[PDB]
């Protein structure tokens, strides 16, 4: 089974929030989220191995933000090498999970001196043939220069992983951190749409588990 | 007096330690620090308005590293605009506080799309006439391209970056900063008393009168 | 007299272009420029000491760009320490010289190893009290979060320099480079407005020379 | 064959030199290079679609630096997508081609406001299992955290970054890239024959059959 760490935003009932998931769809932590239909939102995710705290903030205009944090040592949860990505799922609604931009930075600072390793990428435009992205499910790129995670026109699942593996952590590092930001547009001609969007970190060869729809986000195989 | 927030490393007697000062020389938090004479040390200081946690890690090559954190919302401690610098102060022993490198990055990110403001600077080589640095006290630049914070007696010196840093703002969704500096503390003495720190303060900050020794040149 | 290196865009007759000025208002090089009124433009300026070539590209939507380059060793033209800024001037027209964003990066790579010095700043929003900027002339900040170089409501001159001095070059550097980008909006209810906008590099204590209006751009004292 | 653009340094006899190869081992431009044995060298490679000039500078600490440029619009030479790597090849002498550090930055900037795409990576320490690197030939990682391009005989090895780099695009206003790497070439021999290079090529590029010695492992 794939090892997943995710920060998701979803409006699926199953009894509007953002949550931090560690290997399970049963969020270790959540916070309400005033999902604004048709408005561009921004999410920032940060982590560093000194605080060992995974935090996220999602925001829309008019000071409408939401945050959530969780103390966890990712070095004990994730393998040393991972891939990172975005995932989305919809219900039986006419909705979009468009990503307008996505950036990520990962750094490893060694116990040595001036010995730092890093990876950084930023997409503000997505090409029809975006070769440094691995597309899964209904995810396509290029439409209006954006990354459409789910099929636009019921129930769709899509993911986009950055092509290269990320060395998210290492034993000989004094500090390890990463940051990710993405802007998304969830547009729906429907008032209360069932939707889910997430940023995730997984084992390198991760793929969409059989049956990972709705609240599973294309990340988890059932609500275990 | 000056509004100061510092991350300091001093061996002023009990045991060598690293601490976080929030408007006081009485560290709000400390951790043991096994200071090594003649060895290059590295310090990383991180902060972000989400966790509102200030943390620092000090390490030596092929040795254990000391870390220390502290929950503090700098938005309630510091003025919106500040300057950042490094300060040192020797007790009375023959010791040096050479800075080999120093980087800083500050970012303010507003709700609006792609509305990020950043300031970043990196020094790996210091020149005799370093105009973007405000040197105070016995602080000098140029010797081997290094930044000597103290006189190479009871010396005290600081170096602040010339430009004011918009460290926080009310319209920001996230404000963060990171700072890294490498230092080398030499001393032919056994138990040298020394202090070195990274600090953030009001713009017009200067060395308080008689702020030597344990006062790190930051506190009156 | 101040030592100025500038890349300017101006529509002043004096017989629409972009030009590279080295210590003189008599451009060492120019290129036509299809000034689009009411459209946001972007300018990119680059230089590196290996090519010793100063180049700029200005662009508006619909593939409407313009470029200009000039071979020059800035180390022989500028002092070792400088300040950098933006300047603007208008004629007897109702026009604006609004800067929406401005970024700059300067790097010095020493003959040593892993010994690099850098300075980078980016403004995507300008505060009412922007302390790390030195405002001169009619330049004000904060209006709609922008930097208005000339007074908005005849003939106005304004400049904005970044507060800290830049170590644009040094004898012991193997490579020195800088890059600057800014987006500007020149809006005018008038068809053919007289205007000028520029990015410039000057001696540290540079100020607006007496009489530097119109084509002088607030940078040069007369057309010498 | 593979579409290659390289900046190479080789001592394969006439005199040591650095050159720029554009689809051929017959350098489109060269400059003398006073190679130093046992000394760490640094190479910086820069390019931007405005000047359409590819330039490189190689230098040693406390020594002269060799530079070489060449007007070339890579948009007419390279496919839109490529991979970037380092390659080396020893002649027959006992010599090493250790890479100590390697950085790369590529940016595409469209007309639209703030529509920049960038890729940046930096290696200062190489691990035994470097998954984001495609090692070819005698190339290995881990030894002292360095990247050994050649076997430590007539050895040849390359290392490419795992992810494809969108090096250029028709909708870009400016496309630029920079690359810096530090190398150390040891050899107990007097006139060692060696070759080392930074290259950009088609995605599925691999070491051409018998591309040893002067072929730098890049040319058939």
UniProtKB/Swiss-Prot annotation, chains B, D:
Gene3D superfamilies linked: 2.60.120.200
Sample GO molecular function, one term: metal ion binding
InterPro entries reported for this sequence: ConA-like_dom_sf (IPR013320), Lectin_LegA_CS (IPR000985), Lectin_legB_Mn/Ca_BS (IPR019825), Legume_lectin_dom (IPR001220), Leguminous_Lectin (IPR050258)
Key words, A-Z: Calcium, Lectin, Manganese, Mannose-binding, Metal-binding, Toxin
PROSITE patterns linked to this entry: LECTIN_LEGUME_ALPHA, LECTIN_LEGUME_BETA
Residues annotated for Ca(2+) binding in this entry: 10, 12, 194
UniProt function note: Glucose/D-mannose specific lectin. Has anti-inflammatory activity in rats. Induces histamine release in mast cells from hamster and rat. Induces lymphocyte proliferation and IFNG production. Shows toxicity against the aquatic snail B.glabrata at concentrations higher than 20 ug/ml.
Subunit structure: Homotetramer.
Family, as annotated: Belongs to the leguminous lectin family.
Protein name listed in UniProt: Concanavalin-Br
């Amino acid at each position: 089974a794939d090892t997943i760490v995710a920060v998701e935003l979803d409006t699926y009932p199953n009894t509007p929030h953002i949550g931090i998931d560690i290997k399970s769809v049963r969020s270790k932590k959540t916070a309400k989220w005033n999902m604004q239909n048709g408005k561009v939102g921004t999410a920032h995710i940060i982590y560093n191995s000194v605080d060992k705290r995974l935090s996220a903030v999602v925001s829309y205009p008019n000071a409408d933000s939401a945050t959530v944090s969780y103390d966890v040592d990712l070095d004990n949860v994730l393998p040393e090498w991972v891939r990172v990505g975005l995932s989305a799922s919809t219900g039986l609604y006419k909705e979009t999970n468009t990503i307008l931009s996505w950036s990520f930075t990962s750094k490893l600072k060694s116990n040595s001196t001036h010995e730092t390793n890093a990876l950084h990428f930023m997409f503000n435009q997505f090409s029809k043939d975006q070769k440094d992205l691995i597309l899964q499910g209904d995810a396509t790129t290029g439409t209006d220069g954006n990354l459409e995670l789910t099929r636009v026109s019921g129930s769709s699942v899509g993911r986009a992983l950055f092509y290269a593996p990320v060395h998210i952590w290492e034993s000989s590092a004094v500090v390890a951190s990463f940051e990710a930001t993405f802007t998304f547009l969830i547009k729906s001609p429907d008032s209360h749409p069932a939707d889910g969007i997430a940023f995730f970190i997984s084992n390198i060869d991760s793929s969409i588990p059989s049956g990972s729809t709705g609240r599973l986000l294309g990340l988890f195989p059932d609500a275990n």
